[PDB]
């Protein structure tokens, strides 16, 4: 009753058209870049996104950057994206939702998708936006944000 | 409406790890002025006389917490701790204004002007909590029910 568990990080969606409130979100976690690594480069980005999108996630979070083009494709697939997340926060999110941090998108498996967190809500507190991943199925998987 | 936290939350820690980090009904003083100072012995003496008077002006009001938008020097931190005062430096102007509305204090520019009316007694709790890798200061339990927004809902 008088308590709240979950992860809180200082981040916002990369693009304003993205959903900031998602119930039972399917979460994909990466530690790799979604930027070129212009015609052959543009095709590269397309395929990177295609591999993520095949898994029908609601949220894609990476420790690196996301180019304006990758953001666009994910946006078209109704996917909320968050970039430049600290490695420690990414692991906190992995524990909370049961996702597996993956490097190469083409190696993604349905087993890597996190479905253990019931809420993803991004809201403004003061001057900044905070991302909350709450409603953990495994109570133990999340730390306490509020105790009466 | 059940398990609701109202107040202000700012990304800040105290200036010294051993200051009180949990205070019920804190008396709050807010400033937008510097608590820094700008023959070697003569210099030290001048810096000291200046900082001493500054801290004395503040200490006279028996505050539990002193928060400013600018800096707080080691000597100032030393004199405020001798008075059992918890201090927070470099808070943003926007956050400082939110704290003012939450606790009723007036942000003052010149400590010598300080009076009881300037002391914020409106918030019932100040607490610093570590969330993830960051420290956050929670000023909550607003006495005026129309002063604060919802931070967290349980």
UniProtKB/Swiss-Prot annotation, chain B:
Positions of modified residues (Phosphotyrosine): 37
Disulfide bond entries: 142-148
Chain positions found as N6-acetyllysine: 12
Residue stretches in coiled coil: none
Subcellular location: Cytoplasm
Linked residues for Glycyl lysine isopeptide (Lys-Gly) (interchain with G-Cter in SUMO2): 38
Modified residues (Phosphoserine): 33-34
Free-text description of this protein's post-translational modifications in UniProt: The N-terminus is blocked.
Similarity comment: family membership: Belongs to the TCP-1 chaperonin family.
Function per UniProt: Component of the chaperonin-containing T-complex (TRiC), a molecular chaperone complex that assists the folding of actin, tubulin and other proteins upon ATP hydrolysis. The TRiC complex mediates the folding of WRAP53/TCAB1, thereby regulating telomere maintenance. As part of the TRiC complex may play a role in the assembly of BBSome, a complex involved in ciliogenesis regulating transports vesicles to the cilia.
Self-association state and partner proteins as the record states: Component of the chaperonin-containing T-complex (TRiC), a hexadecamer composed of two identical back-to-back stacked rings enclosing a protein folding chamber. Each ring is made up of eight different subunits: TCP1/CCT1, CCT2, CCT3, CCT4, CCT5, CCT6A/CCT6, CCT7, CCT8. Interacts with PACRG. Interacts with DNAAF4. Interacts with DLEC1.
Protein's name in the database: T-complex protein 1 subunit gamma
Gene: Cct3
First-to-last residue of the parent protein present: 211 to 378 of 545
């Amino acid at each position: 009753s008088c308590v709240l568990r979950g992860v809180m990080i200082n981040k916002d969606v990369t693009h304003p058209r993205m959903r900031r409130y998602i119930k039972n979100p399917r979460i994909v976690l990466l530690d790799s870049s979604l930027e070129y690594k212009l015609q052959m480069e543009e095709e590269y980005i397309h395929q990177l996104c295609e591999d993520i999108i095949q898994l029908k996630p609601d949220v894609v979070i990476t420790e690196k950057g996301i180019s304006d083009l990758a953001q666009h494709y994910l946006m078209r697939a109704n996917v909320t994206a968050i970039r430049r997340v600290r490695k420690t926060d990414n692991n906190r999110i992995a524990r909370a939702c049961g996702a597996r941090i993956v490097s190469r998108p083409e190696e993604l498996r349905e087993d890597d998708v996190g479905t253990g967190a019931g809420l993803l809500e991004i809201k403004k507190i003061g001057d900044e936006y905070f991302t909350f991943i709450t409603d953990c199925k495994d109570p133990k998987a999340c730390t306490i944000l509020l105790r009466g």
